[PDB]
Design an enzyme around this catalytic site. Structure first.
Site, PDB file in Angstrom:
ATOM      1  N   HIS A 137       0.846  -1.183   0.000  1.00 45.25           N
ATOM      2  CA  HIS A 137       0.000   0.000   0.000  1.00 45.25           C
ATOM      3  C   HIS A 137       0.885   1.238   0.000  1.00 45.25           C
ATOM      4  O   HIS A 137       1.759   1.384   0.858  1.00 45.25           O
ATOM      5  CB  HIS A 137      -0.928   0.006   1.211  1.00 45.25           C
ATOM      6  CG  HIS A 137      -1.836   1.193   1.264  1.00 45.25           C
ATOM      7  ND1 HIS A 137      -2.727   1.493   0.257  1.00 45.25           N
ATOM      8  CD2 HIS A 137      -1.993   2.155   2.203  1.00 45.25           C
ATOM      9  CE1 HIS A 137      -3.393   2.589   0.572  1.00 45.25           C
ATOM     10  NE2 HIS A 137      -2.967   3.010   1.750  1.00 45.25           N
ATOM     11  N   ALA A 170       0.364   4.500   0.566  1.00 44.12           N
ATOM     12  CA  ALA A 170       0.249   5.547   1.574  1.00 44.12           C
ATOM     13  C   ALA A 170       0.971   5.178   2.865  1.00 44.12           C
ATOM     14  O   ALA A 170       1.268   6.053   3.684  1.00 44.12           O
ATOM     15  CB  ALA A 170      -1.224   5.845   1.851  1.00 44.12           C
ATOM     16  N   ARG A 218       5.382   3.053   1.177  1.00 44.23           N
ATOM     17  CA  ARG A 218       6.194   3.542   0.066  1.00 44.23           C
ATOM     18  C   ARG A 218       7.318   4.441   0.557  1.00 44.23           C
ATOM     19  O   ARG A 218       8.417   4.445  -0.008  1.00 44.23           O
ATOM     20  CB  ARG A 218       5.318   4.290  -0.937  1.00 44.23           C
ATOM     21  CG  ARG A 218       6.095   5.047  -1.994  1.00 44.23           C
ATOM     22  CD  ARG A 218       5.197   5.987  -2.774  1.00 44.23           C
ATOM     23  NE  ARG A 218       4.170   5.273  -3.524  1.00 44.23           N
ATOM     24  CZ  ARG A 218       4.396   4.584  -4.638  1.00 44.23           C
ATOM     25  NH1 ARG A 218       5.620   4.507  -5.141  1.00 44.23           N
ATOM     26  NH2 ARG A 218       3.395   3.969  -5.249  1.00 44.23           N
ATOM     27  N   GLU A 239      -4.096  -6.447  -7.647  1.00 43.25           N
ATOM     28  CA  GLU A 239      -2.776  -7.000  -7.912  1.00 43.25           C
ATOM     29  C   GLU A 239      -2.507  -8.231  -7.058  1.00 43.25           C
ATOM     30  O   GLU A 239      -1.816  -9.146  -7.507  1.00 43.25           O
ATOM     31  CB  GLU A 239      -1.701  -5.931  -7.708  1.00 43.25           C
ATOM     32  CG  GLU A 239      -1.297  -5.671  -6.273  1.00 43.25           C
ATOM     33  CD  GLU A 239      -0.406  -4.451  -6.135  1.00 43.25           C
ATOM     34  OE1 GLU A 239       0.112  -3.969  -7.165  1.00 43.25           O
ATOM     35  OE2 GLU A 239      -0.218  -3.973  -4.997  1.00 43.25           O
TER      36      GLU A 239
HETATM   37  N1  LIG Z   1      -2.007   8.014 -14.009  1.00 38.67           N
HETATM   38  C1  LIG Z   1      -1.182   8.480 -13.044  1.00 38.67           C
HETATM   39  N2  LIG Z   1      -0.152   9.298 -13.343  1.00 38.67           N
HETATM   40  C2  LIG Z   1       0.670   9.765 -12.387  1.00 38.67           C
HETATM   41  N3  LIG Z   1       0.548   9.467 -11.084  1.00 38.67           N
HETATM   42  C3  LIG Z   1      -0.442   8.658 -10.646  1.00 38.67           C
HETATM   43  C4  LIG Z   1      -1.383   8.107 -11.629  1.00 38.67           C
HETATM   44  N4  LIG Z   1      -2.252   7.347 -10.945  1.00 38.67           N
HETATM   45  C5  LIG Z   1      -1.901   7.405  -9.637  1.00 38.67           C
HETATM   46  N5  LIG Z   1      -0.819   8.182  -9.459  1.00 38.67           N
HETATM   47  C6  LIG Z   1      -0.170   8.472  -8.158  1.00 38.67           C
HETATM   48  O1  LIG Z   1      -0.181   7.319  -7.315  1.00 38.67           O
HETATM   49  C7  LIG Z   1      -0.477   7.705  -5.971  1.00 38.67           C
HETATM   50  C8  LIG Z   1      -1.295   6.630  -5.265  1.00 38.67           C
HETATM   51  O2  LIG Z   1      -0.537   5.424  -5.207  1.00 38.67           O
HETATM   52  P1  LIG Z   1      -1.117   4.127  -4.454  1.00 38.67           P
HETATM   53  O3  LIG Z   1      -0.842   4.267  -2.979  1.00 38.67           O
HETATM   54  O4  LIG Z   1      -2.524   3.892  -4.943  1.00 38.67           O
HETATM   55  O5  LIG Z   1      -0.176   2.965  -5.044  1.00 38.67           O
HETATM   56  P2  LIG Z   1      -0.544   1.410  -4.865  1.00 38.67           P
HETATM   57  O6  LIG Z   1      -1.953   1.204  -5.358  1.00 38.67           O
HETATM   58  O7  LIG Z   1      -0.172   0.999  -3.463  1.00 38.67           O
HETATM   59  O8  LIG Z   1       0.474   0.719  -5.908  1.00 38.67           O
HETATM   60  P3  LIG Z   1       0.586  -0.879  -6.083  1.00 38.67           P
HETATM   61  O9  LIG Z   1      -0.844  -1.339  -6.199  1.00 38.67           O
HETATM   62  O10 LIG Z   1       1.391  -1.049  -7.346  1.00 38.67           O
HETATM   63  O11 LIG Z   1       1.296  -1.341  -4.836  1.00 38.67           O
HETATM   64  C9  LIG Z   1      -1.233   9.019  -6.054  1.00 38.67           C
HETATM   65  O12 LIG Z   1      -0.740   9.935  -5.075  1.00 38.67           O
HETATM   66  C10 LIG Z   1      -0.968   9.551  -7.448  1.00 38.67           C
HETATM   67  O13 LIG Z   1      -0.205  10.758  -7.375  1.00 38.67           O
END
Ligand SMILES: Nc1ncnc2c1ncn2[C@@H]1O[C@H](COP(=O)(O)OP(=O)(O)OP(=O)(O)O)[C@@H](O)[C@H]1O
Ligand SMILES: Nc1ncnc2c1ncn2[C@@H]1O[C@H](COP(=O)(O)OP(=O)(O)OP(=O)(O)O)[C@@H](O)[C@H]1O
Ligand SMILES: Nc1ncnc2c1ncn2[C@@H]1O[C@H](COP(=O)(O)OP(=O)(O)O)[C@@H](O)[C@H]1O
Ligand SMILES: Nc1ncnc2c1ncn2[C@@H]1O[C@H](COP(=O)(O)OP(=O)(O)O)[C@@H](O)[C@H]1O
Lengths: 237, 1112, 188, 271
Positions: B12, B14, B17, B78
């Site tokens: 996740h 937030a 990362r 995922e």
């Molecule tokens: N199309 C996009 N272009 C640029 N930035 C993006 C886009 N979509 C999302 N983001 C960035 O991603 C951030 C959110 O990331 P998130 O925490 O959802 O990653 P995640 O879902 O945990 O990734 P993963 O599933 O690969 O582990 C947002 O703050 C946004 O700025």
């Protein structure tokens, strides 16, 4: 450990383990080189093996030579003597090697080896090797007379004058071949046939009969055959 | 299979990362792992589709779980894709439970459960079902827990280690598999290392270029660097350092900057002052390797003092010049050595054929190429790579190309080390490579002394590991010499203001003499080898007109040819410094040959007779070596040869006499006449001569000798055969006589009294010196005289009473001294070991020197008495007496005797011999008239009977030990006695007169094969073996035989052991019609099938004929 | 020692401090070590001695850093050494605003106030002065950095750079006669 | 090539200098690399190699480093040991092009075993001596052939008359110049560029000196290839170019057998 201690341990190990023929044929050379590395070992190790239990000997060198023959075969000791002759006759290593080879020669004489036994022990399979000085001189020591040495090497060829002359001519083409000694052997062969009073063409055919395929060495060619005929022709007419 | 990425992390954004995911990624980049990073997804592409594609191409998926993992639909999607991919394709999945427990995951309750409920409010049924199933099945996987680790760094390190290992990343290098025999190097170098001494010890590694210092350093670094806090390796420091070095300080600063940047993980440091390394590495265990350190500036830059490094630190510097190590004070030096011939062949085969053994039929040519490659690993690698994919004819026809031209890869590397030399060192290197490859250091110093400082040059070259001095002779490696020869044509030699070059070639460098267009004055050395053809070499008639200043000549004219043109060309030189001509093949040196300048003359094989035919100016001549010139009769006047040092007339058998001008040779130290069958005399030498080595080995016609020698410094004096030598030259002091021997020097009458003056002659022989009447009275003077051989020195009817003064001799062999009659009595030799008096047919008294004798041998004597003083003598390991009748009168002699030897004719059968306790051996020399044998004592090991006419019954029950019963020729033996001889439990041979194997040995045959069965379940078995010999032209008295034994099976091929795997005897008679028996033990429990094989070592002496063995 | 680390164990000894320790270890940096068994209510003389000879200190600030009189005394000694001696002080604001440290507010200020009950006036005054001074100095704001590992690596690199420059030209002072050149060149 | 067989087949390309080995490799990489998951092209490996190469291991390591950096586009990292290429690429489709490989060292650097690349991959190395290919054991070799005479004219007119595949105007001296150029695309290009922009009479003054001496552009490349020979090989080369250009090998051996070891020299020159 000191050099002496390690060398004794190694000799005992090699005499104990009863290993391969070629493995002995190789390790004998390393032991031989370690012997003549410094001047004060042959006497010292001979003294050590002299006092060890076993048959008695007249000298330290006899004791060391007997142990070397027990540890490595007569074939291995002869090969090591032939392959470990230093260059400078007056250096320490030359003296050590002379001590070793003279001890081995006396050891063989004490066991009553024939000339043929010595020749067979020195034998390497290449009929020219018997005329290299490093082997011919050792043979002469072992038999005490060049006539007997030549007779023994002639009989080892199955009394084949062709093979004998091939070997001596090939020995004529060595960088360090003693011309006097090789010529002496050749002259001996000539005199042996002069005692037969063979006619010159009869002598030629006596030589060239063996030029046939009766018997794996390198045969003569008609040119030096005729040369030898001419050589024998007038000298003992 | 194929994957684009090794690891795909799921998490996740937030939560992790920023904090922990970053650290995990950083750790992964440091372990050679390329994980997928979503930040690198190309712009202007659908994130969902690209991410789904990246999931399926990942070998490992790592799922990071947080309390808000369910919050994001991307995470759940995922994860579901990850789990479908694992269950369908087979990608490996690892879990990390970061501040979350697996139990609450599959319940979807409380932590992460609130998030799942919130995110699943708006969806369909199948999405929720897939997410729940995937969540449960991932909570089932055993991974890592955050709360079970006390520090996050260790958990991340463990995760990275696990991922790297389970990737089968094969972190150990497979490159270190094709290298041969570095266990020897590593074991020798561990002893110098001793990494448990917590010092800051410094270690050096030096050797000729191309032995493998760099590879050794690399391998050692790989093996060891993991045990130190900080490690660093610097490769080819010599290459990067500026050659002129205009600004030393800047270069040193840059070098230390590189060392720091690669030691500390600080990627880009800029060092201000050279003291940073000392400041930073004061208290740390540091392993530093520096390769090819050329000069001392690099060492000062990198490691000046041991104080720069903490306790337990090691630095290892590899170089080619030992002077650099010594100047920095290393003293812990590993001199790398050439590999063994077998290992060299293995390296060559690895580089050529790709395996450790050659392909079929290549053996001979491969070994020829190897021998051409010397022993350098660099040369072996170069040649093997050059000949990898070739075929045998290509090998055969490229070998001559290899011989003539040195390969470029070897040449450049050697050139680099050659360029660093000084100019005089370069000239000396060229001289050694061209002419004086294997020569005495003293001779090189004499010949090249005035041109350049030879001593310091040789010392420096040895320091550079470009040459090696073994025993006063310099040695240059074959490849290195070959490189030296090529540069001779391309480089000139400047001594003063002049300029010279050398001529080295087999036969191809002779047309340059026919150039007729260049100045030939710049040709001071010739090295010719004419072992090609008897044809005369071609030179233009005009080249014969020009006169050449040739100072050094080395011609190996090995043929029967005579070279008129070459002789005319060379002997026209005005001044010839040194002249070597092997196989001269002429009669006399030409009269037009000037010899005023002639330091060294060598003719090792010649047909010369009466060379120079006239007196000449041998002003500065220092070495004459006329050897094997068998067709030589005279020798010129040696007057005005005052500087001559050594004269070797080696084996020149036709030299009738030696000139009286040898008196003028004041500085002569060596006279060598090892074989001179035609000498008669030997003229007097002089007063200041001081000969050092006088070697007259077999001068079988030398009659007279000088009356005196003035041998103040006479290391050796050898007259071995010299059959007709009446007197002997006197000696002044001989304070250093390291060797003197007269073996078989018969016809001697006396010995010079001054022989006693030799205070250091530890060893001394007169073996065979017949006709010697009396030893000199001064014999007692020698001290440290340890060994004293006399043998068949008949007519020596005395032994001086001064012998008691010797106080050190251990053995006194006096064999066959058939006229020695007395022996000095009132003497106690405090350290005497043996005393051999055998066949002293008139010795007639007991040898009474009250000593600590351990080996007394009195056989064939005429003693007939034994004194009572013997009980004073504490030990006697051996004591051997030829038996006579009245031994019964000396009971004190019975308990001490050890051997005994019945004579030719003794009727009696001595019963009282049973009384003597220690009787190790008993010999019956011939006993032509004997019948039986009494009960022998209990301690026997030997028993012999050579050619006796009757031993019908051998009534001895004897069960001591290994006992050898040898019976060469005795056929009148009772079958009970014969059976005893065979059926006795010994551990040695037993030999008897028989014509065929006795029927007692059932299992028979005729390298031979013995086949037999067994009757036993599981036991150790004992066998008795019987052997005859092949009927041959064996000598009447062959006296030694050894037998080897091999036992195998035919159901299995297990080579079963055999504890007495050999039987050897140095005294057993070898004869045709005789039976040899011995014993064997076998212990392995193969049941029914045993196959024996008895071989006779020394097959040229004795061959095993018929054979047969038997169980027990 | 090499570096003196100051921190609040209950907050950071487990999560971030271990990473910084590992980075310093891999960069050849040996920070002063301490144990939770090696702490009293006060600091002790040996702790001050270690602080004084450290020649560089790193104050890692967390939410509950002010909630330990031990840590506050350590910070006060660190600032005292900075003002008097040439000690170099580096700060890490682990998710705490420097302004909050400066004015003693927020959750940090609440913890500081709760810790300040019972102490004498001069202790509170020294604590407040040290807190203000440490908030002023330029360090590393954890919130600004997008990547924690990159921030830690940058901190380690800066520490290494500001650690191999203490001794100015201590080596190669064994060069002879430079005073004559310096005097003859000063006139020019 | 036969990509469908998902093996690790290595393929050589060799021919006299100046046929288009480099251009053929570039065209092939341009056409096919899209079918491969990871791919890279290395150009003029021979020129970018240390001529003395005192440490052949350091140079070998940096060559592998260049290959990896170009291939993964991995921001030119530094590499620890020589086995990394296997560790990375043994599990991915690979299209590697190594141009102008001179000696076995570079091959050991970049592609030593087919097990370095894995389930389907192609490595294509262009050389000039067959011996290097043979030592590495490739046996999949394309001996590039000269283009057809019409294609030769098209190339020459492309490089001479400014993109006109046919001539312009006269169309007479063009074929004389071509026949002078033999068939090498290098020779055609050099001669076409030499006469580019000229007029027919200028063309006519340029023709004789062009005929009596070859341009330095061709001469430099030929000289470089010539200098990599043994002295005996150089002598045999001169003998062939001077006297025995078109003669039976047996007669050449019979006439020159006393000097040059003709059989080995011919074998090397053909290689
Ligand atoms: N199309 C996009 N272009 C640029 N930035 C993006 C886009 N979509 C999302 N983001 C960035 O991603 C951030 C959110 O990331 P998130 O925490 O959802 O990653 P995640 O879902 O945990 O990734 P993963 O599933 O690969 O582990 C947002 O703050 C946004 O700025
Ligand atoms: N000592 C410090 N170390 C690191 N970052 C700091 C420090 N002090 C303040 N900051 C950062 O500065 C930011 C606030 O910047 P601010 O808007 O006050 O700049 P400013 O005062 O307007 O600049 P200037 O005075 O140059 O115009 C905060 O987010 C904080 O992260
Ligand atoms: N023990 C060995 N086994 C296999 N190859 C070796 C060995 N030692 C050296 N070599 C080869 O020899 C070549 C030269 O060795 P190197 O270490 O470069 O010598 P140097 O010590 O002069 O640097 C290297 O390419 C190496 O591969
Ligand atoms: N088929 C072709 N069509 C047009 N031009 C070509 C062709 N082949 C080669 N050339 C040109 O001829 C020159 C020959 O160079 P090239 O042979 O590729 O170098 P190398 O000899 O290293 O392979 C190149 O500059 C190229 O532009």
């Amino acid at each position: 450990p000191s050099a002496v201690e390690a060398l004794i341990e190694t000799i005992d190990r090699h005499g104990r383990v009863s290993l391969n023929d070629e493995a002995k044929m190789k390790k004998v050379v390393r032991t031989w080189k370690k012997l003549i590395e410094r001047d004060d070992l042959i006497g010292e190790i001979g003294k050590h093996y002299f006092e060890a239990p076993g048959p008695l000997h007249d000298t330290y060198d006899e004791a060391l030579a007997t142990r070397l023959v027990t540890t490595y075969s007569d074939r291995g000791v002869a090969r090591a003597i032939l392959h470990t002759r230093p260059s400078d006759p007056l250096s320490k290593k030359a003296g050590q090697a002379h001590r070793l080879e003279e001890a081995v020669a006396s050891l063989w004489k004490g066991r009553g080896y024939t000339s043929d036994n010595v020749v067979s022990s020195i034998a390497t399979g290449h009929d020219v090797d018997f005329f290299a000085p490093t082997a011919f001189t050792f043979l002469v020591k072992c038999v005490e007379s060049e006539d007997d040495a030549n007779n023994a090497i002639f009989e080892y060829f199955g009394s084949n004058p062709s093979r004998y002359f091939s070997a001596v001519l090939h020995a004529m083409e060595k960088p360090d071949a003693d011309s006097r000694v090789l010529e002496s052997s050749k002259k001996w062969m000539f005199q042996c046939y002069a005692q037969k009073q063979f006619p010159t063409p009869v002598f030629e055919r006596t030589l060239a009969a063996y030029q046939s395929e009766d018997y794996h060495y390198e045969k003569l060619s008609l040119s030096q055959i005729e040369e030898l005929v001419e050589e024998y022709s007038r000298i003992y007419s | 299979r194929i994957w684009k990425h090794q690891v795909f992390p799921s998490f996740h954004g937030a939560d992790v990362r920023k904090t922990i995911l970053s650290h995990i990624l950083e750790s992964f980049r440091r372990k050679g792992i390329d994980p997928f990073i979503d930040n690198n997804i190309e712009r202007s592409k659908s994130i969902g589709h690209e991410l789904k594609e990246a999931i399926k191409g990942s070998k490992i998926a790592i799922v990071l779980l947080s309390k808000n993992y369910a919050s994001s639909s991307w995470c759940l999607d995922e994860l579901a894709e990850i789990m479908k991919c694992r269950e369908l394709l087979g990608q490996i999945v690892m879990t990390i439970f970061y501040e979350v427990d697996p139990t609450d995951i599959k319940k979807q309750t409380g932590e992460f459960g609130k998030a799942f409920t919130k995110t699943c409010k708006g969806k369909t049924k199948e999405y929720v079902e897939r997410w729940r199933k995937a969540l449960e099945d991932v909570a089932t996987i055993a991974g890592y827990h955050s709360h079970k680790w006390r520090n996050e760094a260790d958990m991340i390190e463990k995760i990275a280690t696990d991922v790297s290992n389970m990737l089968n990343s094969f972190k150990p290098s497979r490159d270190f598999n094709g290298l041969v025999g570095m266990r020897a190097h590593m074991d020798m170098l561990e002893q110098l290392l001793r990494l448990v001494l917590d010092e800051v010890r410094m270690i050096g590694i030096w050797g000729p270029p191309g032995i493998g210092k760099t590879t050794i350093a690399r391998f050692l670094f790989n093996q060891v660097s993991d045990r130190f806090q900080l490690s660093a390796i610097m490769v080819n420091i010599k290459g990067c350092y500026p050659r002129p070095c205009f600004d030393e300080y800047s270069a040193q600063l840059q070098l230390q900057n590189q060392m720091l940047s690669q030691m500390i993980n600080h990627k880009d440091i800029m060092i201000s002052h050279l003291g940073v390394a000392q400041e930073r590495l004061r208290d740390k265990k540091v392993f530093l390797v520096l390769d090819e350190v050329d000069q001392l500036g690099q060492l000062d830059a990198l490691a000046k003092e041991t104080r720069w490094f903490g306790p337990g630190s090691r630095i290892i510097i590899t170089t080619e010049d030992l002077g650099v190590l010594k100047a920095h004070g290393i003293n812990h030096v590993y001199k790398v050595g050439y590999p063994s011939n077998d290992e060299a062949f293995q390296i060559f085969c690895m580089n050529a054929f790709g395996q450790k053994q050659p392909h079929e039929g290549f053996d001979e040519i491969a070994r020829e190429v190897m021998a051409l490659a010397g022993e350098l690993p660099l040369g072996l690698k170069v040649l093997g790579s050059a000949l990898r994919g070739k075929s045998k004819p290509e090998w055969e026809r490229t070998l001559p190309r290899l011989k003539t031209s040195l390969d470029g890869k070897i040449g450049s590397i050697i050139q680099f080390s050659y360029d660093a030399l000084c100019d005089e060192d370069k000239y000396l290197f060229l001289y050694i490579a061209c002419l004086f490859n294997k020569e005495s250091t003293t001779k090189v110093e004499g010949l090249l002394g005035k041109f350049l400082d030879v001593r310091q040059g040789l010392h420096i070259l040895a320091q550079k590991s470009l040459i090696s001095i073994e025993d006063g002779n310099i040695y240059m490696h074959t490849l290195l010499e070959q490189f030296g020869r090529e540069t001779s044509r391309k480089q000139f030699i400047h001594h003063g203001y002049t300029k010279h070059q050398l001529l080295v070639g087999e036969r191809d460098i002779c047309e340059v003499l026919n150039d007729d267009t260049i100045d030939s004055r710049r040709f001071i050395g010739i090295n010719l080898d004419l072992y090609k053809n008897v044809e005369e070499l071609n030179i233009s008639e005009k080249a014969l007109e020009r006169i050449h200043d040739f100072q050094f000549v080395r011609i190996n004219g090995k043929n029967h040819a005579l070279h008129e043109r070459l002789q005319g060309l060379i002997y026209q030189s005005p001044q010839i410094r040194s002249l070597h001509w092997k196989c001269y093949q002429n009669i006399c040196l030409p009269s037009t040959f000037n010899s005023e300048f002639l330091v060294e003359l060598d003719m090792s094989f010649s047909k010369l007779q009466k060379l120079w035919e006239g007196t000449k100016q041998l002003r500065n001549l220092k070495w004459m070596d006329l050897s094997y010139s068998s067709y030589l009769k005279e020798l010129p006047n040696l007057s005005t040869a005052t500087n001559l040092e050594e004269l070797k007339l080696r084996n020149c058998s036709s030299l009738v006499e030696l000139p009286s001008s040898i008196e003028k040779l004041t500085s002569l130290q060596i006279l060598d006449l090892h074989r001179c069958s035609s000498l008669v005399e030997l003229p007097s030498f002089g007063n200041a001569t001081k000969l050092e080595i006088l070697n007259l080995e077999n001068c079988s016609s030398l009659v007279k000798l000088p009356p005196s020698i003035n041998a103040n410094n006479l290391q050796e004096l050898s007259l071995t055969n010299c059959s007709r030598v009446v007197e002997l030259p006197a000696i002044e002091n001989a304070t250093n006589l390291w060797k003197l021997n007269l073996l078989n020097c018969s016809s001697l009458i006396e010995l010079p009294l001054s022989i006693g003056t030799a205070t250091n002659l530890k060893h001394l022989d007169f073996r065979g010196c017949s006709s010697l009447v009396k030893l000199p009275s001064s014999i007692g003077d020698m001290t440290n005289l340890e060994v004293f051989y006399l043998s068949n020195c008949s007519n020596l009817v005395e032994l001086p009473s001064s012998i008691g003064n010797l106080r050190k001799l251990t053995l006194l062999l006096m064999r066959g001294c058939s006229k020695l009659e007395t022996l000095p009595t009132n003497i106690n030799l405090k350290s005497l070991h043996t005393l051999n008096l055998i066949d002293c047919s008139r010795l007639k008294s007991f040898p009474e020197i009250s000593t600590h004798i351990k080996y007394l041998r009195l056989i064939g004597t005429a003693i007939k008495e034994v004194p009572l003083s013997i009980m004073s003598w504490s030990p006697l390991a051996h004591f051997q007496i030829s038996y006579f009748e009245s031994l019964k009168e000396f009971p004190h002699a019975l308990d001490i005797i050890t051997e005994l030897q019945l004579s030719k004719d003794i009727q009696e059968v001595p019963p009282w011999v049973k009384r003597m306790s220690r009787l190790r051996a008993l010999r019956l020399n011939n006993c032509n008239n004997l019948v039986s044998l009494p009960q022998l004592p209990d301690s026997l090991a030997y028993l012999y009977a050579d050619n006796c006419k009757s031993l019908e019954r051998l009534d001895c029950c004897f069960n001591n030990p290994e006992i050898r019963l040898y019976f060469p020729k005795c056929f009148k033996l009772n079958q009970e006695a014969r059976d005893l001889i065979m059926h006795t439990s010994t551990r040695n041979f037993a030999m008897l007169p028989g014509t065929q194997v006795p029927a007692c040995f059932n299992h028979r045959a005729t390298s031979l094969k013995i086949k037999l069965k067994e009757s036993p379940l599981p036991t150790t078995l004992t066998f008795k073996a019987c052997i005859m010999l092949v009927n041959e032209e064996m000598s009447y008295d062959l006296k030694s035989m050894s037998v080897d034994i091999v036992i195998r099976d035919e159901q299995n091929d297990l080579k079963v052991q055999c504890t007495p795997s050999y039987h050897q005897c140095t005294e057993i008679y070898v004869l045709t019609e005789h039976i040899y028996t011995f014993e064997l033990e076998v212990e392995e429990v193969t049941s029914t099938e045993l196959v024996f094989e008895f071989t006779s070592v020394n097959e040229s002496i004795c061959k095993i004929g018929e054979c047969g063995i038997l169980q027990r």
